[PDB]
Write an enzyme that holds these catalytic residues in place. Sequence first.
Site, short mmCIF file in Angstrom:
data_model
loop_
_atom_site.label_atom_id
_atom_site.label_comp_id
_atom_site.label_asym_id
_atom_site.label_seq_id
_atom_site.Cartn_x
_atom_site.Cartn_y
_atom_site.Cartn_z
CB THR A 272 100.73 63.62 36.35
OG1 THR A 272 102.09 63.16 36.28
CG2 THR A 272 100.09 63.00 37.56
CB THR A 273 102.77 62.04 31.31
OG1 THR A 273 103.92 61.98 32.17
CG2 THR A 273 103.24 62.38 29.91
CG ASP B 135 105.50 54.60 41.84
OD1 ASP B 135 105.27 55.81 42.00
OD2 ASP B 135 106.62 54.16 41.51
#
Lengths: 517, 508
Positions: free
Chosen positions: B81-82, B382
Amino acid sequence: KSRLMGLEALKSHIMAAKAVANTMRTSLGPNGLDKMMVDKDGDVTVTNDGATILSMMDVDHQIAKLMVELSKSQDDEIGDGTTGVVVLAGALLEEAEQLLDRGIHPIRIADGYEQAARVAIEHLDKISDSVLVDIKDTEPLIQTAKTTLGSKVVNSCHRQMAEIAVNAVLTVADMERRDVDFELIKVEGKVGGRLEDTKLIKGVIVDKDFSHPQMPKKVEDAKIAILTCPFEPPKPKTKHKLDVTSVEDYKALQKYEKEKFEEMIQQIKETGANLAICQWGFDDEANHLLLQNNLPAVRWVGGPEIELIAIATGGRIVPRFSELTAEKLGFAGLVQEISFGTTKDKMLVIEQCKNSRAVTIFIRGGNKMIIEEAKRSLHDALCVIRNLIRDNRVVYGGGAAEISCALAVSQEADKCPTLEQYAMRAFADALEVIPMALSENSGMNPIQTMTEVRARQVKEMNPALGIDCLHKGTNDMKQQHVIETLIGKKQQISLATQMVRMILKIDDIRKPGESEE
Amino acid sequence: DRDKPAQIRFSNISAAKAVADAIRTSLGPKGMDKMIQDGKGDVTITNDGATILKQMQVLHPAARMLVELSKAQDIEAGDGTTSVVIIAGSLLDSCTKLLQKGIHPTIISESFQKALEKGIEILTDMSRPVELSDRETLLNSATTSLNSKVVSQYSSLLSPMSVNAVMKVIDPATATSVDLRDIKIVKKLGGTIDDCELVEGLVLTQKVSNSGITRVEKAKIGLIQFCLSAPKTDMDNQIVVSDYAQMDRVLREERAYILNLVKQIKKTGCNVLLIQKSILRDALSDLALHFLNKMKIMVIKDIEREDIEFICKTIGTKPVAHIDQFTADMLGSAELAEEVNLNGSGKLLKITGCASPGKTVTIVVRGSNKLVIEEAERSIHDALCVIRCLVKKRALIAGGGAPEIELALRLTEYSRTLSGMESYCVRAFADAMEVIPSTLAENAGLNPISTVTELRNRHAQGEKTAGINVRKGGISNILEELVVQPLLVSVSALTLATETVRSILKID
C-alpha cells in the site's frame, strides 16, 4: 560584482535562449511567420529569418550574443541552418535543467548530448552521402533551391536564381578544393528591379557609365585602362579643400584642368586602352576632354574596385597614370551599360568570360526588402548549393530526420548503463521540437505531427515523407521536396550541442548582474 | 474554462503530489518513518503511508482520494500500500507535463489504462508463477515474501498457521482469491502465540448459560432475532404503570409470554442459541432466559449481529427471528460446542466440527499478553495477505522496485512503437516507473539516477539480471536474496492511481 552559480546563472543561461528561440521558432522556416521588427531608429524590419532576427536582436546575456553569432557560422557555412541551430540549443537547456532537476550533475548532462551528437550527425550521413557535379547538381540544386529560395518564400521562377547559383559557387568554391569560397562571388544588385529579373554576370559591372552618349557606348574587347589617376578631385586620406575667391583666379582654373586631362586622356588613349577606368574617375570637365580626344572611358570608381577590375578581368595591373604602358591594361569581354528592363538598375558591364576571377550575381527587386528578400533567399541557397556542389548530400528534413535520429539515440540511450542515456534520451528528445514548432508555424497539431512521422519512421525507417513544411497538404519531405544539404543538417547539431556544452561547462559567472551580453 | 478545473485539477494535482512524496520518504522499510502530530498534539511515528494517509490528513479532495489509493491496495492485496502511493505522484508529475504539454486530460487518461494493460503483461512477463495448489510452495513463497518483509518471528510460526488456515480455505488448485472472508481471526487474552490455533468451527465470544448445558455436542445453533422481553407497554414491562393491583395480573402476562417464546425456542429446539446483544435487541427478558437455560439449552448471549452475519455464512447458522426459523433449518449443526477458558485468561465458545458452508476456518490468537496477541495479528494477516496476494494473482515477482526499472524502458519504446500523439503520454506514462525505486534507492541510500540507470541496462539485458535488493538496497539479483512479491501487490497498485488520476484528469 557577484559570482552567480548554481541554478542562479543556470536560469540566466536557460532564461535568455527561450525569448530568443521562440521568435525564431515562430519565424522558423516558410511556415515561420514574418516578424516586423522596428529599431529605436523607427524603422520597420520584417524578419522571418532567425538570423535576421538574430541580426535584429542583441539579447542581454553572453550566450544570446553568441547565438546571434552561432548561426552566422552555419549562415556563412551553410546558409540555411540559421534558425534551427539556436531554437533547439535552448531546448537542451529545457531538457538539461529538468535533468539537473532530476539531480543529474550539470557536466554529466552537458556531456551526453555531444556524446549522443554522434548519431545525430551520423544518422544523417546515411540518407544522402551523394556527390554530383555542376550540371548534375543543378537539378538537385534547383530542387534544393526549390526549398532554399522558397525558404524566403521566393522561389517562383527563381530556378533562374538557383541555376545562376549553380555556376556561381563552383566557379568560386571548387568541388575539388572543398574549401568555402564566396569571395570571388561579387554581390551586386539594385533596388527597383524584379524578383523575376536576376542575372549572373560572370564579369564585373561598374555603376559608372560612358562619360558621353556621343562617345561610343561600346568599348572593344580588352584594352581597358586600369589606373589611379585624378580626373576629378583626388580625395586622398586627408587634405582640406580651398576654392577660388577672385575673377582673375577663376579663369586659369579652367585652362589647366583642360590641359592635363587632354594629355592624360590622350596618353591613356595613346597607351591604347579604349576604356579608361580610373581609381579617381572623371569630373564632368574630364568628360568633354575625353570626348575631345574621343575615347570611351569610365568616371569615378571605388578605390579597391579598380583592383576588382584587375583581378576579375585577368588584366595585368598598372597602378597609376605615371606608369602607363600598352602591355598591362584592363580587360573586358564587352563593355556595355546594361539596363535589365528596370532602368533603376543600370550597370556598365566590364565583361569577363575567358578569364573571370570574380563571378558577379546581379540581384534585383522592387524594394529594399525585395532585393534583400531575393538576396538572403539566394545567398542561403548559394551556400547550401555550395555545400551540395562540393558534395551533394541531402536529407528529408523538417523533423522527418529528427524523429529518425530520435529513434537510434533514445534507443541507444538505454543500451548504455551510463548516466548519459538520460542525456541521450533528452538529446534525442530535444530533437523533435523542429517539426513540432514547424507544425505550429504550419498551423497543425505539433504533437501528433512529430509522431505522424514516427508512425512513418516506424513504417518508413527513414525520412522520405514528412509532415507539412509548406502547409500544402501533401505530407512529404520527398515529393514536397524538403531537401537540404546534409552537411548543414549536421552543422546545426555540432554547433548547437557543442555550444550549449560550452555554455553548460560554464555555470561560473562573474558579472555585476545575472545575464550580461 | 476547464482551465479553472485544470487549475482546480492542477490544484488537486498541487495537493496530491506533495502528499505522495511524504510517503516516498517512507517508501520501503529502508524508507523512513514519519513523525506526526495529531489533534493530541503528540508525535506519531510510522513508516506506514496508509496510516500517515489516514492518521493526520487533509480532507482536500485530491488527498481524500489518496487514502483509498492505499485503502484499496489495503483491501486489494492487503499489502503493497506504500507502493500504490509511490506510484501516484510519478504520473501525477507526468500528467501535469502532458497538461503543460497541453495534452487533453481525456487523451491523457485515454492513453493510460490503455497502456496500463500493456505494462502489466511485460510486468507479468518478468514474473514467475508458483504453485497455488501446493501448500508448501506458497508456504515457501509467502514465507519468502514474509522473509522479504519485516514480520517473521510469529509469521514464521504463523506461516503454516496462515497457509494451513489458508489451505483450509483453499479448496481450489487455483486457490481462488483466498478470501479472508471465510477466515475468522479470533484473539484470546490468555495463552501464547503458540496457543494461537486454527479452529475449524467458529471460536465464539464467551458463552452465556444460566442452567444451560456447558458444552452440547452435535449442537443445533439457534439465533435470536426476536425479542424475548414481553412487549413494552410502559417501560420494559407488559404492565402499564398506575397501581399495584392491575399490573400484577399483567405482570402474570409478562411472565408467561417470555417463558412461552422461550418454551417455543426449545420446542422447535436448539442445542446452542446465538444471542446478539440485548441492545442489538429491543429487549431480551432474562427471566425468560433464566428459564431458557433452565430448559438446559447451551447458549451464547451478546454477540455481534455482524459477527452473526459471519457466523451465519461460515458455520451456516442462519438469521433467526422466529421459533419457526428454529427447526434444524437455520440452525448450524455444531459437532462440538464448548467454550475454552484455558491457557491463561479468556473464554471463547469453540465450535469443534460443524455443519458449515465452505470450509469454515477460525484462528484463535492467544499471546503472552495483549501486545503479544496484537503482534501476531499482522503476522498471519501479513502472511494471509501475501497469500491472498499470490493465490489470487498466481505469478510471483521479486520486489525491490526492479520491475519498475524493467518496465519503464520497455514502455518508453512501446510508447515509441505505439507512436501517435499519445506516445509522449505513454512515454511520460512509462516514465513514472523508475521514480518508485528512485526514491527507494535513496530510501536504502544510493544515487538511483546513477544506480537505476544501470539496472535499467541490467533490466535492458536480462530484464532482471539484478535489482534493488532491500538489504543491499542496490544492484544485485533480488531473486538471489529473495526479495519477492506476488504480482497482486504490484498489479493492484497500478490501476488505482492511474484510474484515480484517469479520474482526476476528467474530473473538473
